Amino acid sequence: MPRLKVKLVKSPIGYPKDQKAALKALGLRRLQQERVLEDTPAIRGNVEKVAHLVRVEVV
Amino acid sequence: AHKKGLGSTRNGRDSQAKRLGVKRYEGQVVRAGNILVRQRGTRFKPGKNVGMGRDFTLFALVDGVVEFQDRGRLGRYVHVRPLA
RNA sequence: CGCAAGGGGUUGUGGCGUGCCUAUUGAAGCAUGAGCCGGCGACUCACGGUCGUGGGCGAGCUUAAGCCGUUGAGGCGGAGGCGUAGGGAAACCGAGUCCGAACAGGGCGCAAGCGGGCCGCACGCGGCCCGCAAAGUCCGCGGCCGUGGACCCGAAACCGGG
RNA sequence: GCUGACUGGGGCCUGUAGAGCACUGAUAGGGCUAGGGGGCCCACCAGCCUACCAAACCCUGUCAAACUCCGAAGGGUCCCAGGUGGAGCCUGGGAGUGAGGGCGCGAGCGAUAACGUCCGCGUCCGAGCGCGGGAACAACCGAGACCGCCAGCUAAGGCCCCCAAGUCUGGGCUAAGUGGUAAAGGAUGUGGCGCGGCGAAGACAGCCAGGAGGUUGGCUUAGAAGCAGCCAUCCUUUAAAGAGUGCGUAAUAGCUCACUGGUCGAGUGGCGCCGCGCCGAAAAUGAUCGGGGCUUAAGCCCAGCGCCGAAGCUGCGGGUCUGGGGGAUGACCCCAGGCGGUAGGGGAGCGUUCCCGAUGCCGAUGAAGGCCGACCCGCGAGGGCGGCUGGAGGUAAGGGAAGUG
RNA sequence: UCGCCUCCUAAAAGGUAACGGAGGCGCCCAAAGGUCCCCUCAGGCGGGACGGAAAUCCGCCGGAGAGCGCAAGGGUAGAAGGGGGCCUGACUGCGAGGCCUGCAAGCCGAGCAGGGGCGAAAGCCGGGCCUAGUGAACCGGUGGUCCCGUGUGGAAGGGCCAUCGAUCAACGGAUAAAAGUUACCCCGGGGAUAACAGGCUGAUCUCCCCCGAGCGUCCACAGCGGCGGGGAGGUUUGGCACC
RNA sequence: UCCCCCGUGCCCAUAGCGGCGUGGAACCACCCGUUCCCAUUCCGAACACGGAAGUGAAACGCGCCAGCGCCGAUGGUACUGGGCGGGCGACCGCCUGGGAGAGUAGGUCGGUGCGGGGG
Numbered sequence A: 001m002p003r004l005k006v007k008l009v010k011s012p013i014g015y016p017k018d019q020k021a022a023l024k025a026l027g028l029r030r031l032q033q034e035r036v037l038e039d040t041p042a043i044r045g046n047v048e049k050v051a052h053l054v055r056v057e058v059v
Numbered sequence B: 001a002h003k004k005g006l007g008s009t010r011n012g013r014d015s016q017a018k019r020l021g022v023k024r025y026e027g028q029v030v031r032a033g034n035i036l037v038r039q040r041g042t043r044f045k046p047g048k049n050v051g052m053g054r055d056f057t058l059f060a061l062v063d064g065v066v067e068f069q070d071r072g073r074l075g076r077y078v079h080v081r082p083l084a
Numbered sequence C: 001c002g003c004a005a006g007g008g009g010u011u012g013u014g015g016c017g018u019g020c021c022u023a024u025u026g027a028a029g030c031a032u033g034a035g036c037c038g039g040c041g042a043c044u045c046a047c048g049g050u051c052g053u054g055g056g057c058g059a060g061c062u063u064a065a066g067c068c069g070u071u072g073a074g075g076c077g078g079a080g081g082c083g084u085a086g087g088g089a090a091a092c093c094g095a096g097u098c099c100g101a102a103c104a105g106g107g108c109g110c111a112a113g114c115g116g117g118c119c120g121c122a123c124g125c126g127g128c129c130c131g132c133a134a135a136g137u138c139c140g141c142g143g144c145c146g147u148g149g150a151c152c153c154g155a156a157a158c159c160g161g162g
Numbered sequence D: 001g002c003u004g005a006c007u008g009g010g011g012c013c014u015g016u017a018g019a020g021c022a023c024u025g026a027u028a029g030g031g032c033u034a035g036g037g038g039g040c041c042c043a044c045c046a047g048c049c050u051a052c053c054a055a056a057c058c059c060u061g062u063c064a065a066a067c068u069c070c071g072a073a074g075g076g077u078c079c080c081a082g083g084u085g086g087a088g089c090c091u092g093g094g095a096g097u098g099a100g101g102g103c104g105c106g107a108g109c110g111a112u113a114a115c116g117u118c119c120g121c122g123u124c125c126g127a128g129c130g131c132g133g134g135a136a137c138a139a140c141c142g143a144g145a146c147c148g149c150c151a152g153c154u155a156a157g158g159c160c161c162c163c164a165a166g167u168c169u170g171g172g173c174u175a176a177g178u179g180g181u182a183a184a185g186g187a188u189g190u191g192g193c194g195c196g197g198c199g200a201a202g203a204c205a206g207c208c209a210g211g212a213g214g215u216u217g218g219c220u221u222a223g224a225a226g227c228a229g230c231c232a233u234c235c236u237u238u239a240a241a242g243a244g245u246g247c248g249u250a251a252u253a254g255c256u257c258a259c260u261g262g263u264c265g266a267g268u269g270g271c272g273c274c275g276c277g278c279c280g281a282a283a284a285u286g287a288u289c290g291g292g293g294c295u296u297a298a299g300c301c302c303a304g305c306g307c308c309g310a311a312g313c314u315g316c317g318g319g320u321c322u323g324g325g326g327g328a329u330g331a332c333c334c335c336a337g338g339c340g341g342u343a344g345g346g347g348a349g350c351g352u353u354c355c356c357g358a359u360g361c362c363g364a365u366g367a368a369g370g371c372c373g374a375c376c377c378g379c380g381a382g383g384g385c386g387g388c389u390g391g392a393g394g395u396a397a398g399g400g401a402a403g404u405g
Numbered sequence E: 001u002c003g004c005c006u007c008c009u010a011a012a013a014g015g016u017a018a019c020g021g022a023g024g025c026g027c028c029c030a031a032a033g034g035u036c037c038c039c040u041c042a043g044g045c046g047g048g049a050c051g052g053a054a055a056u057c058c059g060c061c062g063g064a065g066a067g068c069g070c071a072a073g074g075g076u077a078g079a080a081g082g083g084g085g086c087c088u089g090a091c092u093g094c095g096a097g098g099c100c101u102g103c104a105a106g107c108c109g110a111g112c113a114g115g116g117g118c119g120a121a122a123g124c125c126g127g128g129c130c131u132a133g134u135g136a137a138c139c140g141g142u143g144g145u146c147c148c149g150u151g152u153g154g155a156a157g158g159g160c161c162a163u164c165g166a167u168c169a170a171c172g173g174a175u176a177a178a179a180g181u182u183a184c185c186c187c188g189g190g191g192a193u194a195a196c197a198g199g200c201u202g203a204u205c206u207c208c209c210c211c212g213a214g215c216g217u218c219c220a221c222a223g224c225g226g227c228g229g230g231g232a233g234g235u236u237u238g239g240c241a242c243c
Numbered sequence F: 001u002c003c004c005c006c007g008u009g010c011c012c013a014u015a016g017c018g019g020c021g022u023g024g025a026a027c028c029a030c031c032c033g034u035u036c037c038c039a040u041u042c043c044g045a046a047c048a049c050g051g052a053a054g055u056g057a058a059a060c061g062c063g064c065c066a067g068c069g070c071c072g073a074u075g076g077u078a079c080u081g082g083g084c085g086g087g088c089g090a091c092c093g094c095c096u097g098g099g100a101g102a103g104u105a106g107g108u109c110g111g112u113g114c115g116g117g118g119g
């Protein structure tokens, strides 16, 4: 499918737990780091929830 | 030092919380006995395969699934359709 | 200083910089303690208990006092203790038992082999063996608990004899 | 041993926000209308009127944490899916903690005062008083520090000097040092939108003339003549002049303006907005936006390119914890993540006294201790080796005890 | 003030604090219980002998505003309300499975057995429309049990089952048994907590400003300023409890 | 199969209330009686029984109307998950999802299964 490339750019320090959890679910840990995931509703779920900390682009 | 006589109250007593409400929502599998709803009055009428206790305490008596049903001015219900 | 690279002492400028301990929501703190140095100074031991762990033996394990020996030599000693049946308030019954009138129910209970080399060499695995169990015990070690002053220092006081 | 947080899709459970009066209450006015002051009163047989009081009821307007005809966002839970995480679950050993605090949001209390207080979610501090920004500053903005580098890109915040980087590029605003921090409320401060009204058949301002007769309009203890409250709320000769716009008489008088003639002969008054500014604005040691200083800005608003800038992120070298593999078990290799930390838990080690090892082994060619070291090993506690002092003890590997730092 | 119940605060699951807001309980019922069969309210408007504006009647209209022992809420006439008949399940032995929950407590309960109640029957009955009407243990009392009973037998005395004695209300309950005073005072602690001063705040206080009732012979603003409104200061009295 | 009626359930007001039609051939009801089973706080009103002269009046069934009730858009707000800002404060604004309540246009005097009797 259209794997999405999410990159964490804003620090999660100071955001609710669910937000930090979302990142953990996406596989994002450090900053800048960018992962490539399968574009499915469940993935979009978190990415959109923590989009205010990770920049997205399609691939 | 100013502590002029301090008035008083009384109506500072409350009752224990009873944790009432629906304990099992439709779609949930329940064994016989599982007390689905636990209201006070008749907010929820007993449906097919359901039993009412002293306190209108609704409880399933058949091992199956749960589900409600709004009958309008006939009052809501909650029958446990058997796992057939 | 050294042949050198390099290194040692000092500190002129520049940059950066809110003692230590303690106690606190929060201390450089204008909260506590310390003048400085040296030396003394506080989580132990005994017996029980409970886990864990290194071993021994395991349907079992183990001795105590004491006796004989040594004189830094160990033996003997089964009284006794745990363990091998759980239930019941009990009598009592027993893989059952307790409540009950009840083969209704239900509360405690029980129901342990083997991953498996070898090999007598029945086309049978006996059973030797095995982890350490069924499964436990004994000793060592460690953690914590109980009783002891029980981590160390400190009362104001109580009582006895003078 | 995939079940975790989190997320997608289903199914309902609910009464907050909001809103709304159908319930319970609260509501202003009006209508209609039981009563009751009371009123014409023909007097018991009703009756009639009422800019008073006033039910029930209807209409128009609303109000509620303990109201709800209604009702979100969300939230809860179950099912199916993603999700291999210092996720979860079960059993046991050791805890510490049971004074919390600031910020945001939702309530109470308070006086919608408090660096106040009490709950709710969240988040930081606590334990991140480690690092950057905020002048300084636990909790605001940035960001989670394993070690090293005289390399690189960024974050917030910045780029005139202090001070690293634009006296950067276009369009505006401000004239106060506003910027560099206060309100109601004021005001021909500036700049920009509006929308109406007048004007080359001459508006606006100024100037010139008129600004009259009804009459001093009726009404008042004094009087009230356009200028204290009303009815009718109008007429006259007119270019046009009110039963009068202020000033003013005790009252008249007087001076005016409403209106229009006329000169003049190009614009001109009304109000509604928006931006930024002015006043409103007085407190105690010496002043200042951190300072210097800054005015087409070094202020404010809006575009744009580019740099600076952390212990964040890359690059390079190293250590260590897990897991997976190499597995020639080589305990050494590549791969993958991780490694702030108080109370605490856990795991490794260093050193001190003493015992076995010891009828041994070091030692006067010098024991132990002391004083030095820029050298060697170790992450560290240390262990070496060397020079001086010292002058008689010391004690390996490997283990064992404990008055052990 | 201290335990229990209802409503709110509580932010639409549950839960949730304050010397927050507002009310109740410490009973009661042998019929106010079980079952079977009937019945349906309150008010509004008429019409009505005494009749208040509700006594009881009659006629429409009226889904619930009445009623349900008592607080409040939820519920409810397709009865839980109102009446009548037999009755005692206000059972014994249990109890799958759950709600709630730190602990033990609280709560719902189908179903089996024994023996019954009402109904033709299907069936329903293990108190009450529901949520308050309550009290662990210990120590003893009274019935039963036959369980034990100190060499034996029996007793004494216990146990087990049932039940009783609590404003143990400071309501998880220290003893069976309990008040004061200290300026004659003492120790251990705390800036966890008051008095002083400071700090934060600014109700109160002091000050000035906005509005212009209305006073000032006339005239709002010479001098004043009703009802009300916006501020500054931090010298008052306090609030808070920060070194 | 297709109309009418009689019982029955489902949907729970767009499924009703109230006006105006109409229907009895059949079924149903009202009636005729109440000796008998059975009855009333007292009444055969209601239950109940035995009937059959008369009737559709009542009640009920089936149509008609929009006035009350009810249903109710589309738009536009409010409010709000999440994100980002302003004000001393009381409060407020932008982004992205969700999105009422009222109000308006308008909608409605039902829909529908199973079994019976009848054309």
Ligand SMILES: [Mg+2]
Pocket: A013, A014
């Ligand atoms: Mg942040």
Ligand SMILES: [Mg+2]
Pocket: B052, B053, B054
């Ligand atoms: Mg029951």
Ligand SMILES: [Mg+2]
Pocket: C023
């Ligand atoms: Mg202290």
Ligand SMILES: [Mg+2]
Pocket: none
């Ligand atoms: Mg602390």
Ligand SMILES: [Mg+2]
Pocket: none
């Ligand atoms: Mg000092």
Ligand SMILES: [Mg+2]
Pocket: none
């Ligand atoms: Mg000090």
Ligand SMILES: [Mg+2]
Pocket: none
């Ligand atoms: Mg102290």
Ligand SMILES: [Mg+2]
Pocket: C021, C022, C032, C033
């Ligand atoms: Mg100290």
Ligand SMILES: [Mg+2]
Pocket: none
């Ligand atoms: Mg001192």
Ligand SMILES: [Mg+2]
Pocket: none
């Ligand atoms: Mg010293």
Ligand SMILES: [Mg+2]
Pocket: C038
């Ligand atoms: Mg010393």
Ligand SMILES: [Mg+2]
Pocket: none
């Ligand atoms: Mg021991």
Ligand SMILES: [Mg+2]
Pocket: none
């Ligand atoms: Mg031990």
Ligand SMILES: [Mg+2]
Pocket: none
């Ligand atoms: Mg059994």
Ligand SMILES: [Mg+2]
Pocket: C153
């Ligand atoms: Mg001591």
Ligand SMILES: [Mg+2]
Pocket: none
């Ligand atoms: Mg003496």
